[PDB]
Ligand binder design. Sequence first.
Ligand SMILES: Nc1ncnc2c1ncn2[C@@H]1O[C@H](COP(=O)(O)OP(=O)(O)O)[C@@H](O)[C@H]1O
Ligand SMILES: [Mg+2]
Ligand SMILES: [Mg+2]
Length: 216
Amino acid sequence: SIRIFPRIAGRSYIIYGQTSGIICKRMEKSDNEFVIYNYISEHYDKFLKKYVPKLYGKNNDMLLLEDLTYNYNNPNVMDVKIGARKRKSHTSGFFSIRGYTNSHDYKFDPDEYLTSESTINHIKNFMEAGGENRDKTKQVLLKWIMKLSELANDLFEINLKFDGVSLIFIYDDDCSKCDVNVVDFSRVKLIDTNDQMTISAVTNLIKILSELADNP
Ligand SMILES: Nc1ncnc2c1ncn2[C@@H]1O[C@H](COP(=O)(O)OP(=O)(O)O)[C@@H](O)[C@H]1O
Ligand SMILES: [Mg+2]
Ligand SMILES: [Mg+2]
């Protein structure tokens, strides 16, 4: 029958697709996520291609999405909420770490407000699976910085309020492959300006990751 997908965070029903390379995500509250994927396809197709998992189509209340973990032997995943929270402030000031591979072992708590030092330590914890090969882990950080920098640049020209959106960071244990993409358009709204809050989240992550990539 059905294979439940190993979600790192979130609340939605997510299962493996019937065929390889697909996950199916239930739209739990409304079809807003589908309305927004279609809006971005129509008005911002370049943003959609670069930064967002492919939407393959819809099956009743289920979105057929590109499985971002598919081509990884040993994927390590971290979900960072960069859009505004429903009614609370961010746990790390500009963003909220929602979860990561092995976070239970590090006594991580998504509800816990973090100092700058604790925020950096959890991102370091997420990177420990990448082992003691400094060079390869440095290249992972630099590839994320490359993509997030372009994203922050591109966000200045996008008139959406990115409420609730997450960055999904992924790297393989052997650090031969990594990526970062934007997911969760369930609460995204149309507006007449760019989203300065979301831009501040991304530039803050770029600062943190840059420090890690340069730190001896
Ligand atoms: N396209 C995807 N590929 C792989 N994992 C995904 C994908 N979309 C979501 N996930 C996983 O599901 C979790 C929740 O996704 P999200 O879209 O934020 O759902 P929710 O609305 O439940 O918060 C993420 O933390 C990640 O682990
Ligand atoms: Mg989410
Ligand atoms: Mg892609």
